[PDB]
From Swiss-Prot:
Modification sites for Arginine amide: R17
Coverage span on the entire protein: 24 to 41 of 77
Record-level GO BP terms: defense response to bacterium
Name of the protein this chain belongs to: Tachyplesin-1
Keywords carried by this UniProt record: Amidation, Antibiotic, Antimicrobial, Cleavage on pair of basic residues, Disulfide bond, Secreted, Signal
Free-text tissue specificity from the UniProt record: Hemocytes.
A cellular component annotation (GO) from this entry: extracellular region
């Protein structure tokens, strides 16, 4: 349910984990 910004080596995408 929690959606957060995920930055993977400069590549950021917003993912909802639950």
């Amino acid at each position: 349910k929690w959606c957060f910004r995920v930055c993977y080596r400069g590549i950021c995408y917003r993912r909802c984990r639950g």
